[PDB]
C-alpha cells in the first residue's frame, strides 16, 4: 500500500475569519448536544447499562456535557471476551489491511476536528489551540502509527542464513490487552495508546478517564464508523479503581497500556509482574507515569525569547501536562533578567471559561483544584510567593498563574508533581549546579535549556537525563514522528511514542526453519 | 570499523586425527588441573574469600573439578558500587571501541576452545561435541553482538524532520545489571547474557550457576585478558538465593538478564516489578524460562528421519535443554512406524562418563539425578514405560534413555519440564489434534514437525504456537543470527536471543530538539 510520506497535522491558530467562525459553529453544535448520553462499546455494539456516570464543565461546573454508562466487572469481562475472540482473526488480517482500517479512521477524524476541539474546551478546560492540537496529535498518531506497522509485516525479521534451510523469522501480535488514559489528552493519548497496539495486530479494553469520558466516546464513535471488527477495540468508561483493577490483575489480560500518575503506575507495574492465578504468561506493562520537568537558563540565553518559552510550557493548558515546565532552574547572570522578564508576561496572562480561548482555563475538577492549592499552600512554607497563588473568581475551577522563588533543590514543590500552574523558580552558581539540580529528581521526561554557549548545549545532550530534551524552545508539545516521546527514571518504562520502535512492544517474535 | 560478515564458528565433530589429538590433549591438562582455585572477580581484580564452593565432577562425583570464592551481600555491593563507577564511563566509549572488544574477547576464546570444551565435559558432563557447540555458540554471541551493536550507534533512530530544528534521537545503556546464568549452556549463555548488555554500553554482575563455577571462572579469565576496564564486568559465584535475591531486590540494580526454571523466573519477574526502597526507576528483567517441547511427527512424514531427529532432541546432553523434545506427538498413521525406530535407536545409546565421548554422559548432580528419578515414578502411574526408567551403576549420575508412551496429554510428564533423558509419547488422531495437543501446556519455546504435506507444514507456521519452530530437523540447537532464540508464554518474555532485537532491551532513547 502507497500513501503520502507522513506529515504532521497542521495545528489551527484560529487566525482567520473562517477558522473562528468554524469554532464558533463546533462549540454550538457540542453545547446543543450536552444532553446526549454515550453508551459502553463491547463487540462492536453500543451498550447501555442501568448506571450512569455525569461529565461537568470545569469553567461552569454546574453544567453537564454529557452522560455515560458505567462500566463494572461484569461488562469488563464480558468486553475481555468479545476481544479475544476479535484477536483469533484480527491477528491474521494483511498488515495492509489493518493499516488501512487506521487511515480511515484518521479521515473521518480529520472531518471531525472542530466538534472534537469543541469538545475538549468543554469537556476538560483546553482553550482554543490547545484543543486544536490535542485533535491534531491523536490524527497524527493514527497517520503515523499505520505506516510504522508496515515496517513490521511478514516476514520482516533480518536472519543469517543457513545451507539447505530457509529461516524465516516474523512478528506476531500479543493479544488482548487493556489501555488506561489520561483526562489531559483524552483525544491524542487516548487514540494513540489504542491504535498502536491494534495497528499490528491486538485488540483492545479502553478506559477512558472520569473526566474526559464524552470525548472517549465521541472517538469511538468514529472507531465504529471506520468499521474495525467487533471486539476489536471496546469502550469502559468506569468511576473509580473498579474496572481497572479487574483488568490489571485478570489472568487473561495480555498487556497494560497506561498514561497518568506514578502512584498508580507503581501499582500498575507491580500487579503486572505478578502470575495470576491461572495465568499463562508474563504480562507486558508500558507506563508514562509524569515529570517534574526544568528549563534551564545561562546567563549567554536570548532572555526574552527563554521568557517566552518557560511561559508557554510552564502554563500551557494550566500546567496540566507531564511535561510541563514545573521548576526554572536560573544561573547566577541569567537570575535577574529572566526572572524579570517571565513575571511580566506571566502577570499579563488571561484566565477564564476555555471557551472564550483565555491564555489559562481551569483545571479539569474540583479534586485537581483540591490538590493545587494544597501545594501553594506547601509552597508558602518553602519558597516565597510572588506572582498569583490563588483561585480566581466564579464556579468554574480558575487558577492564578502561581510563581514561587528561592526554592530548595529538595523542596517538595521542587519534587512532587504538581499538574497545575505553578513554576519554582530555583537560583543556581553556575552551568554544572544547573545540571545537578534538574537531574536530581526522581523523574526525566521532560527538560529544556535556553543558551547561545554551544559547549552547554552539547553537555547537555549528554548529561540533561531526560527522554526529551529541548534547546532554546518550549518543552512541551512533543509531535508524532519528529520527537518520539517518553522519559527515563520515575517517568515511565520509556515506550517512545510516535517512534518507530513503540509497535515493537506489542509484538513478539517467530522463528521458523524449514531443512529441505 | 569494518569485519568480515557474520558466519557462525563451525561445531567440531573430532571425525579428523588432527581434531582428536588436540581434545585428548585438552581433556588430559584440564583433568591435571583439577583442583584449582578460582577467586571472586570484582573491579578488575580476583578477589578471594574464606568460604569457598566446591565444583565435582558429575560422571565421578568423588573428583573435584576445582574451587571458588562465595560471595555474600558484602561482594554483591562491592561489585554494584564497581559496576556503577566502571558505568559512568564505559558508556561514553565509541560503539566501535566497545565493539573491538567483544572481537578481542571471541577472539581469546577461540584460541581456548578446546580448554573451554574439555572443562565442560568435566564440569557440566557434556559429551565431546555438545561441548564444542556450546563453546562455539559463545564465540557466535560474542562475534554476533559486537557486529549487531554498531546498528544502534549514535545518532541510530530515523525521525520525521521539523523546519527551523534539529532532531536527534539515539540510544543510551539503562546501567548497571544483574545475570543470573544457567548450568546448562554455562559457556553459550553465561557469555551470551553478559556480552550482549555490555556490548551496547551497560556493566553487569554476573552469577553463575553454582554447578558450573569452574568453566565460568574462565570465562572471565579472557575478559580480563581481553581487557574490559575494571567494574565493567564482575564475577560472583554463591550458594543459594542469597547473591541473587539480593541485588534482583536492590533499589540500585537497573535490569535483571535471567535464564534458568519457571519457578525462579516468577519470583524474579515478580520482585523486578516492586519499587524497592530508594529506587529510582523501573526494572526491566528478561527471564527465559524453559518448556515442554513437542516434536509432532504425521504418516507422510520421513520415519526414520523423523526417529533420528526425536532422538538427537531427546537426548542430547541428556534432554537438559529448554529447547529438548520432551514429548513425541504421533498421529495414528504415524505411531507404530515412529515409535518403533525411536525405541530401536534409543536403546542403542551409550551412557558413560562424559570424557569416554558416550552418546549421553550423567546429569549434572545428585539434586538433578533425584528429580528425574522421582518424575520416572510419577511417569510409570502416568503413561506405560517401554524403554529405561532406571539408574545406571556407578557413582556418576547416570540415567537410562527414557521413553513412555500412551501418555495423556495432561499427565505431569506430559506438561511439567523434567530436564532429563525423558520422552513422553502421545498418540493422537490427526494432524489437528496434534496441534491442539502440543500447544496445550504452559509453554512455548521450541517445537518440531515431521511432515511431508505442504499444508501441515504451513498450517503449523501459523498454529503451532513457540517461538522456534522446526520442519523436517531436530529441534535442539539454534544458531546465534540465523534462528532468534526464545519463547512464548511461561517459557518467558521472549528476548531474542542471536538476534538484533536483543541488544534493544539494554538501551533506552532519549529525543533532542535544538530549534535554531
Ligand atoms: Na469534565
Ligand atoms: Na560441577
Redesign the pocket.
Known sequence: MTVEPFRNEPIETFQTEEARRAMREALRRVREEFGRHYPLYIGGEWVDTKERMV????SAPSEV?GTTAKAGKAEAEAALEAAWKAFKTWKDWPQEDRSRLLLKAAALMRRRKRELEATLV????KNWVEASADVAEAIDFIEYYARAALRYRYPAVEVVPYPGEDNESFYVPLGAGVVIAP?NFPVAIFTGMIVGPVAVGNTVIAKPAE????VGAKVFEIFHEAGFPPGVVNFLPGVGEEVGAYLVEHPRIRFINFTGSLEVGLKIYEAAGRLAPGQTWFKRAYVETGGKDAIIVDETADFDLAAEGVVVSAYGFQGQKCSAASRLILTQGAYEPVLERVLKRAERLSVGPAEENPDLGPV??AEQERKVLSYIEIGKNEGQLVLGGKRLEGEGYFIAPTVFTEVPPKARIAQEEIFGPVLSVIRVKDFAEALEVANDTPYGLTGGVYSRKREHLEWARREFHVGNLYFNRKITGALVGVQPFGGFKLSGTNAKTGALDYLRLFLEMKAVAERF
Do not use: K, Q, R
Open positions: 461529565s461537568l464543565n470545569p456535557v468543554y469537556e476538560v478546560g483526562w473526566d474526559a469520558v464524552v479539569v475538577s
